[model samples]
Target chain A: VPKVTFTVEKGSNEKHLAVLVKYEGDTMAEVELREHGSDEWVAMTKGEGGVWTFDSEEPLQGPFNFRFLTEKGMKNVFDDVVPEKYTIGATYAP
Target chain B: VPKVTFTVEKGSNEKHLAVLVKYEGDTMAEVELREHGSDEWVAMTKGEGGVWTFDSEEPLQGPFNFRFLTEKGMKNVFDDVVPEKYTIGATYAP
Candidate 1:
């Protein structure tokens, strides 16, 4: 099972996202988010304990795209989908 | 914003539903749940702290319906929807 999970926290004025991943000793990691219609990418911040988080002042209307980063490689996640919450895992090839 | 929020706790065995409602002056409150394909209404238990909860022994896939109960009257809620989570406030009229 993928240890990475997405959390959508509904705030009073804005919605926040927490993307938690299992720690595999990666040096650095982050996430990129973009709204469906726009091509602009908003980079998420890495929080303590391997949690990448982003706070959206505006409500997220998708299909949104997510990409996960690691020291070894990166991958596009939650591709072409709209979801309230999502969970995924990283697959590294030998 | 509604004080009541519905949570889908993805359990290892089965998913549990927590229908947390704001504590009103009402003495009692409960909820009815039904899967999309069935007409049967499964009653939820009123837990402490005004939380109505249900533990589905099996996985729930829906299009589900929910109804609420109170000391004054009952109301149908979340009609015709498939939601990751939902929030609703009860409106009572004299």
Candidate 2:
């Protein structure tokens, strides 16, 4: 798998949050996230240099399972990709 | 005040954690962080482009107060410097 970076940043409002991922390669590739507790898969916006980002309209709580959907298909956020400490069976706290 | 970026990453072990700050300017300037529960200030190692970093030897819990030490003086981890959502009276969760 290509190197993928995941980051969560503070949002504008109480319910706002920003999630970012950097997967270098195809610019046209689609990236999406399935946040724990939500049944729907949220789409991410493509940015410069293989970066995909999403900002939440509502507050998000974690310790939840999340996975990424790329052209390759569903991907697990494992320790090999993310920092060793942040990995939790594809579950992360943000 | 210069633009400063702070980031927390997972460590190698359960008790391990990595805290990073990027303060661009004066490479010799010192950067340090005082974790919430401890009374002592921890020194950060300088890296390329004014980046300072520290790794925790013990597990850290948050919702605690923290601040930075630069050549000028004590600095607050305010909303302006960090992501709006991550700011908490100089406190951060990592």
Candidate 3:
């Protein structure tokens, strides 16, 4: 089976998104890429660094979204992206 | 305003809890400590290195609990001390 994890590194000119597809079993994984607010999806290819990058220069904004395309897929880990360190809320217990 | 953030660093004999107290406007934020299964509370101390550490040598087990002890105090960042990563359903009564 294949499980993919995506990482986004914010940069000056553009943001770099690296999709890592790992296979524990003997099945090839194909990831379908789509950007935030975009209806059309494009297929991504793994490059020499094993991270899938798109040639189109599009900068990621404050919010981002994406999802994985797999057999039992369409997981929402990458969708509705925000800063990982954003405060969830102020919670306390006496 | 005073805001406190607690960090947990795991050690063999203990897990050191670092409480960072920051003042943006005025005042110091305090949080009270409450254990997972105990209702009794304790005040935390900010150390020389700017981290709060309880003198108890009791190593943090599957879970631990704590909060910052300050004026607006009692935020739970240290309560239920588990590994930075844990199997939630397996260890906690969420």
Q: Model 1, range A5-91, lDDT digits (tens) per residue? A: 444322312266655544344433446666577444455656876666666756766655665545434334555543433333322
The CA lDDT at B7 in model 3 is 44
For model 3, the local distance difference test gives 0.39
Model 2 off-target regions past 4 Å? Answer: A9-14, A24-28, A64-66, A69-94, B1-94
Ordered by lDDT, highest first, the candidates read 1, 2, 3
> Which should have the higher TM-score, number 1 or number 3?
1
Best by the lDDT measure: 1
For residue A85, give model 2's deviation from the true position in Å: 13
Q: How many angstroms is residue B92 displaced in model 1 relative to the true structure, after the best TM-score fit? A: 18
Better model by lDDT: candidate 1 vs candidate 3: 1
- Candidate 2: the clashing residue pairs are none
Per-residue CA lDDT of candidate 1, range B1-94, in tens? 5444454333312266655454245433345667677544555556776666666656765655665545444344665443533333323111
> What are the runs in model 3 whose C-alpha is more than 4 Å off?
A1-94, B1-4, B9-16, B21-31, B62-64, B69-94
- Which CAPRI category fits model 2? incorrect
All candidates in order of TM-score, best leading = 1, 2, 3
Candidate 2 or 3, higher TM-score? 2
lDDT of 3 by residue, B1-94 (tens): 2143334434323444443334333333333344455443444444655445554445434344554323332224455644434432332221
Q: TM-scores for all candidates?
A: 0.35, 0.30, 0.29
